[PDB]
Design a protein around this ligand. Structure first.
Ligand SMILES: Nc1ncnc2c1ncn2[C@@H]1O[C@H](COP(=O)(O)OP(=O)(O)OP(=O)(O)O)[C@@H](O)[C@H]1O
Ligand SMILES: Nc1ncnc2c1ncn2[C@@H]1O[C@H](COP(=O)(O)OP(=O)(O)OP(=O)(O)O)[C@@H](O)[C@H]1O
Ligand SMILES: [Cl-]
Ligand SMILES: [Cl-]
Lengths: 390, 390
């Protein structure tokens, strides 16, 4: 019964169709379905990070396919010297294949696994690829990840870029099978905030809805946008952008009247829903700096006796965006940043620049200290009241 | 600059060494390092789920290597008809290779990707494999995932099983590089609770510390163990074990005096730290059943006016353990169960059996209702007290 013949080797993209949970995620609640679009978008954003793409158009078609057009360099079209087919076909049909295993093509990229669009292809009943590169238009069609013919020159062009349109496999995706405008818009808005000078257009051909994301203000405007329907309690958004020992750190924050903590973390524009070394550095610095400031200004009595890290973060909105040549995550999902050097990179910058901010904006600083004290008092009233019910 | 020659294909286990975050996880905080041991253990547990292994020995050696010995069937030793080397070498050296892509060798298995021990091998500067199978002892040594010679017969035996000892690569693992007794013990204890009749031994050859996990009581004893140092508020642990439409559902729960909710979810013995369809079914049923009971017993006035799902779960300890022929997760980490059929499987069983439990144990039922009401009152006192500080 259990012998050498029980041992099965999945080849090509078969492994992706066998276990889509491993590659695209939840194939049932819609998160995976939208992640098919995000893999293609993230590849275009990487062209932008590299300085080669200023213009991205995402289109929800009336047949529930999605296309992503960029004006970046184009997916390489040349025959791959080892694989014997176009570099484009290698990218589409081979796991762990791409230009983000070194710093030669992208200095900084959210991509690192070499599986993103090979996974989109595998789980798409159809993919259309159109490449503008080296004065030529290249076209290729895939069905369930199988190329219908070699990548072929169809025209001349003086432009560069990539168009991928994919029809998600109805065999793979279940329950939530239709693209939701607002799920795509949330991520493209945030990418606009993170990539000033990149025009991102979202077009819905089902109902003619259109958006053009080209936000003024970067992550400063991002924090203003996030605090819109909260009541910001101080007018000076804390902001900085630094680069040291090859690490980009960009931070913006502002407190509001509410009781939530919302710190949005990013590595090469990829969100970390479970934080990591950038959040850990941000937190250490915020605590050290606020505690140092409160001690120096004599306000420490409450902070010294009770006020803690948690109560600093009550009503906090912040964006922490880092640029890392070779990031490490805790998993394939890239939801937690592991790169240990990023923690001191964020921590030393925040320590210096948040200290300066509090000296340069004493009105803001007194309001934030007020906020910290009020959050401690509420926390202690609540603990006391739970005890009294017993 | 950016052309077909920029496109690199990682072959064999190179992809695992290039991006260990994708395969083993955090290579810096120790979680990944311990996960190397858990991949090998989980493979032995799968032999147990299949009915073929009653005995597992995990050993921390004084050189910081780890071995896992099972008395299961043995890794197949026969030449693989396609790959041309031993099935064992295929398992060790090929991603997406194994016997858990169908229900022929394991009816139910935590394994499903075919990468677990191929990843351990890749990130081990040395791995020793010893297989007892078909009356023969088979031995093979790997260095950095490269076999030093073909799997070779070295002896006769009337026994079956697998021994893997691995020396983690000092190039891959950083900061936390030493195995922690207690991290391994926590998981082997829980596996003992989940697998009655499987003897699990943990041996530390650094200090001679030994444990033998062969717990009496299954997940009932698991819940008793978890409530030890809390104050259980009712003596009748709710418990059931069912099998319907090919899904095993096993639940045990008991309330304590504390304010935490702790629901430990498992699929084929793999933990879901982020829950999924089993937790969602458990929650729906618990809410429907408690609400139905409170309404019928007339206690509903508080529950109807205020008491909510959250306050049911305050002071709750529970274990939800499901057995699923072909599970689907939201990611490679297997931390969230996606299989949608599991939600109604857990929900219908809990609805019926928790209803019966509350009718059959009216003293417990009145205490749990008391608990639910008290948690609402504390929640409302706390909200009120936060408002009054403003
Ligand atoms: N829009 C694009 N323009 C140019 N090159 C692209 C584009 N999309 C993909 N590529 C190339 O194809 C390669 C493979 O992309 P794929 O998404 O499969 O993996 P990756 O982006 O390298 O990593 P990840 O799996 O983390 O996304 C990229 O590394 C890049 O070299
Ligand atoms: N201790 C063992 N005894 C018997 N067969 C084993 C043992 N360990 C591994 N195998 C075999 O080797 C195969 C490959 O194991 P591996 O851990 O690489 O992947 P998997 O267990 O199939 O899935 P996953 O990647 O989710 O762990 C298993 O499917 C099984 O057939
Ligand atoms: Cl065999
Ligand atoms: Cl090229």
């Amino acid at each position: 019964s259990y012998d050498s013949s029980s041992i099965k080797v999945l080849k090509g993209l078969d492994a992706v169709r066998k276990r889509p949970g491993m590659y695209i995620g939840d194939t049932d609640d819609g998160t995976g379905l939208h992640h098919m679009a995000f893999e293609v978008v993230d590849n275009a954003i990487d062209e932008a990070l590299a300085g080669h793409c200023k213009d991205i158009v995402v289109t929800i078609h009336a047949d529930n396919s999605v296309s992503v057009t960029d004006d970046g360099r184009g997916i390489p079209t040349g025959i791959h010297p080892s694989e014997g087919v176009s570099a484009a076909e290698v990218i589409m049909t081979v796991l762990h294949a791409g230009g983000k295993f070194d710093d030669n093509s992208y200095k900084v990229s959210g991509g690192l696994h070499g599986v993103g669009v090979s996974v989109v292809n595998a789980l798409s009943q159809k993919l259309e690829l159109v490449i503008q590169r080296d004065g030529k238009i290249h076209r290729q069609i895939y069905e369930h990840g199988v190329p219908q013919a070699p990548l072929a020159v169809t025209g001349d062009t003086d432009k560069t870029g990539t168009m991928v349109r994919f029809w998600p496999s109805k065999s793979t995706f279940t329950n939530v099978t239709e693209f939701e405008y607002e799920i795509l818009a949330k991520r493209l808005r945030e990418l606009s905030f993170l990539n000033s000078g990149v025009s991102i257009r979202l077009r819905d051909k089902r109902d003619g809805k259109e958006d053009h994301f080209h936000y003024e203000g970067g992550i400063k405007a991002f924090v203003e946008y996030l605090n819109k329907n909260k009541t910001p309690i101080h007018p000076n958004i804390f902001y900085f952008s630094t680069e040291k020992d090859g690490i980009g750190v960009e931070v913006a924050l502002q407190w509001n009247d509410g009781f939530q903590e919302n710190i949005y973390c990013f590595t090469n524009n990829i969100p970390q829903r479970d934080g990591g070394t950038h959040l850990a550095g941000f937190r250490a610095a915020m605590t050290r700096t606020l505690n140092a400031y409160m001690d120096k200004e004599g306000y420490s009595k409450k902070a010294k006796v009770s006020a803690t890290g948690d109560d600093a973060r009550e009503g906090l909105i912040a964006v922490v965006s880092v640029k890392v040549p070779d990031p490490k995550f805790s998993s394939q999902t890239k939801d937690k940043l592991v790169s240990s050097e990023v923690k001191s990179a964020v921590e030393q910058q925040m320590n210096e620049l948040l200290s300066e901010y509090l000296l340069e904006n004493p009105s803001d600083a007194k309001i934030v200290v007020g906020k910290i004290i009020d959050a401690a008092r509420a926390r202690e009233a609540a603990r006391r009241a739970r005890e009294m019910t017993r």
